[PDB]
Amino acid sequence: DMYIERAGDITWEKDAEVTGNSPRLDVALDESGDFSLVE
Amino acid sequence: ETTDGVYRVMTRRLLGSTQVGVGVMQEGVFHTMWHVTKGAALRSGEGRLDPYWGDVKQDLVSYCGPWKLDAAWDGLSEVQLLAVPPGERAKNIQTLPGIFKTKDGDIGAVALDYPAGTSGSPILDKCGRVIGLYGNGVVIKNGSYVSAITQGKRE
Ligand SMILES: N#C[C@H](Nc1ccc2c(c1)CNC2)c1cc(Cl)cc2[nH]ncc12
């Protein structure tokens, strides 16, 4: 049986760790909700 | 507990307590990704949360009521992933999203790497509004993970 526990508030944190890139990807979404890459 | 906020989705079916995902509680409705619960009922203390709406293709599901989250990424600004990783504290990670180009349109995408149990972690705009959930995407050449900014529709 699944259960939930509170983990925090939903707020924007000013001066948070800024990381990650911004890729432009050609994707496809199938009937099962799974993404795949095209070329 | 029906307090607004971010919640861990746990199971006791496996060894010890295992985190399968995360979700958002907003306006009395619990929102998560379909692949986390598979549409099964959830427990919150003594209370029961029954599914209300779900869709395998969108990979979303709402408990106690219709989907409430309708804010959208503006296509220009940086956003925050409120990552809630298994066994670790909630943590805001600011990033500028990329794009998933599809035959049905472009969708925002966050290029951040987290365990599969982080699925359902909300993505927020500068006002703290939930613009979507993290946990449905693709694995690129690099071996890294890139998730869509998956948002539902509010009726
Ligand atoms: N767990 C899980 C996630 N994938 C998933 C798994 C099953 C389905 C979908 C997405 C939609 N259709 C069914 C997932 C989430 C994160 Cl945060 C990272 C990850 N890396 N590899 C899978 C992975």
Molecular structure report:
Chain A: Residues 1-39 are cytoplasmic. Chain A: It is found in: Host endoplasmic reticulum membrane. The complex is a heterodimer of chains A (39) and B (155). Chain A is mostly beta strands and 39 residues long. Chain A is 0% helix and 46% strand. Chain A is built from no helices and four strands. Chain B folds into two domains: 5-63, Thrombin, subunit H; 79-148, Thrombin, subunit H (Beta Barrel). Chain B contains one helix and 15 strands. Chain B has one helix spanning 34-37; strands at residues 5-11, 18-26, 29-32, 42-44, 47-49, 51-55, 60-63, 79-83, 91-95, 98-102, 105-110, 121-124, 130-134, 137-139, 145-148. Strand 1 of chain A pairs antiparallel with strand 1 (5-11) of chain B, so a sheet runs across the interface. Bound molecules: ligand A1B9L. The ligand N#C[C@H](Nc1ccc2c(c1)CNC2)c1cc(Cl)cc2[nH]ncc12 sits between chains B (35, 59, 114, 116, 118-119, 134-136, 145) and A (32-34).
Key terms:
heterodimer; A: 39 residues; mainly beta; two-stranded antiparallel ribbon; 0% helix; B: 155 residues; Thrombin, subunit H; 4-stranded antiparallel beta sheet; binds the ligand N#C[C@H](Nc1ccc2c(c1)CNC2)c1cc(Cl)cc2[nH]ncc12
Give the secondary structure arrangement, pairings included.
The complex is a heterodimer of chains A (39) and B (155).
Chain A: E1 2-8, E2 17-18, E3 24-29, E4 35-37
Antiparallel strand pairs in A: 3-4
Chain B: E1 5-11, E2 18-26, E3 29-32, H1 34-37, E4 42-44, E5 47-49, E6 51-55, E7 60-63, E8 79-83, E9 91-95, E10 98-102, E11 105-110, E12 121-124, E13 130-134, E14 137-139, E15 145-148
Antiparallel strand pairs in B: 1-2, 2-3, 3-7, 4-5, 6-7, 8-9, 8-12, 10-11, 11-15, 12-13, 14-15
Bound molecules: ligand A1B9L.
